[PDB]
């Protein structure tokens, strides 16, 4: 009882190609559902919508969510990373739990224990990929509350189905500690950079191609003017040159002007929006396949559901204006990827003849074609780290559409609850999570200096990423990783 089972370790070390980030926080865990496993559905919610129809069980267990970068990186360390490195990726995980206390409603209950274990077998439903709240707090002096575990399973409307499922040795702990080590499956480096060149401008400007394109389909003005004339694709007509590789897939998003007077005065917010359907439930496409948020020189427009939107500190839950939230732009990937609010391109819709003129049509969506290249969606200091891959017969490019690292074996879910003894009871403790990161340096010989990240030096009421006069920590703006530049 009079023994301390762990110290407070919070720091970061910069060693070679590695970065070691240790984040300790304090948690407080109450009793969920009064130790009960309770069926939930839309029917207690009322089920006013079909596409919102769900079913599942809400369970007393909690869980530790460190899955967001703002847990493991100070706004400085995030700056020291994204400015100097092409890529990073997690290597190891080291988790600890210690200095357990149990309370009774307030005095010490010294004989109570705390059930905590990990699922390394990935047997339970995995909720950590949907970017929920409950994460460790970004600022170390904040005590956080543990979120409740609960899951969903198959249903027909509100009712369950026969194929649905329902759901462990748990080390019981106030002088005990709990630790475990987790190893990440090999994942490619997150690409924190922007290409110097655009896909369509990979050619040498000063020389011709040896390939020919068809310039003239007719001779002149009149009847029976048909002729064929050919030309060398070169500097004069860069657009028509033969190309080896082509931009990645596109699924069009409805364009939205941030200046509202330009925006249409109609309710296009839901019906207008693109989506997908699964078992006759149309679901919104969010954030969707990575696509540049906007064309060159238009920063006011953004895709309707395409990009990630973060709330500012203190922003309310419902009906907050566009000045209470943060909105993230993909403008870096405009090099290799189509714009969401633009079509992929045009095709031919018919055969021409001397009778009928040629026709074209717009491509509002394009799947994969051999020779497509693309960039994925960036991660943010406020953004998620990893997501779990579904277990399926096949998949393509498992990287999670919200950004981060897709894995068939993500960090295991760490479950915790108070052992029931009922008497009002709650526990606290300490958690020190430690992740080891690998770095990919940059050998770039580019002469002119890079775009970096800076703190604007000008007199201000408060400092960014600091505490206001009441001590409310604030992250003023989303920070992406892509600043340094690479060749294409």
């Amino acid at each position, epitope marked *: 009882v009079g023994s301390s089972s762990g110290n407070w370790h919070c720091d970061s070390q910069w060693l070679g190609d590695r970065v070691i980030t240790t984040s300790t926080r304090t948690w407080a865990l109450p009793t969920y559902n009064n130790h009960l496993y309770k069926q939930i559905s839309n029917s207690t919610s009322g089920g006013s919508s079909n596409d919102n129809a769900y079913f599942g069980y809400s369970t007393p267990w909690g869980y530790f969510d460190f899955n967001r970068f703002h847990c493991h990186f100070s706004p400085r360390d995030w700056q020291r990373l994204i400015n100097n490195n092409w890529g990073f990726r997690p290597k190891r995980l080291n988790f600890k739990l210690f200095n357990i206390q149990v309370k009774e409603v307030i005095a010490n209950n010294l004989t109570s224990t705390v059930q905590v274990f990990t699922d390394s077998d990935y047997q339970l439903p995995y909720v950590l990929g949907s970017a929920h709240e409950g994460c460790l707090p970004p600022f170390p002096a904040d005590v956080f509350m543990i979120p409740q575990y609960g899951y969903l399973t198959l249903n027909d409307g509100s009712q369950a189905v026969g194929r649905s499922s329902f759901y462990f040795p748990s080390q019981m702990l106030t002088g005990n500690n709990f630790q475990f080590s987790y190893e990440f499956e090999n994942v490619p480096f997150h690409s924190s950079y922007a290409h110097s060149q655009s896909l369509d401008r990979l050619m040498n400007p000063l020389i011709d191609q040896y390939l020919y394109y068809l310039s003239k389909t007719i001779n002149g003005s009149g009847q029976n003017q048909q002729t064929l004339k050919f030309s060398v694709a070169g500097p004069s007509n860069m657009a028509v040159q033969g190309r080896n590789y082509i931009p990645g897939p596109s699924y069009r998003q409805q364009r939205v002007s941030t200046t509202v007077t330009q925006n249409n005065n109609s309710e296009f917010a839901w019906p207008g929006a693109s989506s997908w359907a699964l078992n006759g439930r149309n679901s919104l496409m969010n954030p969707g396949p990575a696509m540049a948020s906007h064309k060159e*020189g238009e920063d006011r427009f953004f895709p309707l559901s395409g990009s990630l939107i973060f709330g500012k500190q203190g922003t309310g839950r419902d009906n907050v204006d566009a000045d209470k939230v943060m909105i993230t732009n993909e403008e870096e990937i405009k090099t290799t990827n189509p714009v969401a609010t633009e079509s992929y391109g045009q095709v031919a819709t018919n055969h021409q003849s001397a009778q009928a003129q040629a026709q074209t049509g717009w491509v509002q969506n394009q799947g994969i074609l051999p020779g497509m290249v693309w960039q994925d969606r960036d991660v943010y200091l406020q953004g998620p780290i990893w997501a779990k891959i579904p277990h399926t017969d096949g998949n393509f490019h498992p990287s999670p559409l919200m950004g981060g690292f897709g894995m068939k074996h993500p960090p295991p879910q760490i479950l915790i609850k108070n052992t029931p003894v009922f008497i009002t009871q709650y526990s606290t403790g300490q958690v020190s999570v430690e992740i080891e990161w690998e770095l990919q340096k940059e050998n770039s010989k580019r002469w002119n200096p890079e775009i970096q990240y800076t703190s*604007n*030096y*000008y007199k*201000s*009421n408060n400092v960014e990423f600091a505490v206001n006069t009441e001590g409310v920590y604030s992250e003023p703006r989303p920070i992406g990783t892509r600043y340094l530049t690479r060749n294409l």
Partner: antibody
Amino acid sequence: VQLVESGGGVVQPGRSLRLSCAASGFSFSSFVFHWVRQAPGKGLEWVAVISYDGSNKNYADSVKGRFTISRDNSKNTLFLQMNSLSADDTAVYYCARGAICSSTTCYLGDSYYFYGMDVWGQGTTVTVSS
Amino acid sequence: LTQPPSVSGAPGQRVTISCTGSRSNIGAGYDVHWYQQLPGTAPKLLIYGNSNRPSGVPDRFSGSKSGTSASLAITGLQTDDEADYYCQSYDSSLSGSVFGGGTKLTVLG
């Protein structure tokens, strides 16, 4: 210290008229000059900005290529000659002199950023209409 | 750079005008220069620099810069203070200065 204008008139669409600004009472060379156009009911619009000795000139977008700027130092005059006027250009034109600088870039002291226009002229009405 | 279409205040009070700005405009730290013009007369520079009043300017006329949006607070409103105010700043992407949309202060007396 005075800054005037002249050359205004009734152009009608499609034709050019030079617009000149003569100035005395201050050193002509040591100050950078601006032209700023004001529609009757619309906020001040900055037409052009020319540096001292006229080495570098950077137009606004709307007028790019259909205007030109010439500054003759010897006679202490600022000359703005335009071309291919449409009826969207009918408005007053103020001859300005930039001095004050946006703070952090004052050391670089470029031709641009001297958007501070301490004093400027009486303006002249150039009306483009058929 | 956008200003309120109209601002209105009574004599003997505190009127404020504020021009919000973009990153290309005020994010860079570029100074925001305020102008006034009595109607149908040549505009006069008012607050040269971020918050400085030049020689020959009333003390009550004061303005500042914070974030991307500068503000101008006139104290002890006078009849002579009814006129059009204009917020200018340099815009980086444009590469030329952008004046505001214009404002007319209304003395309600």
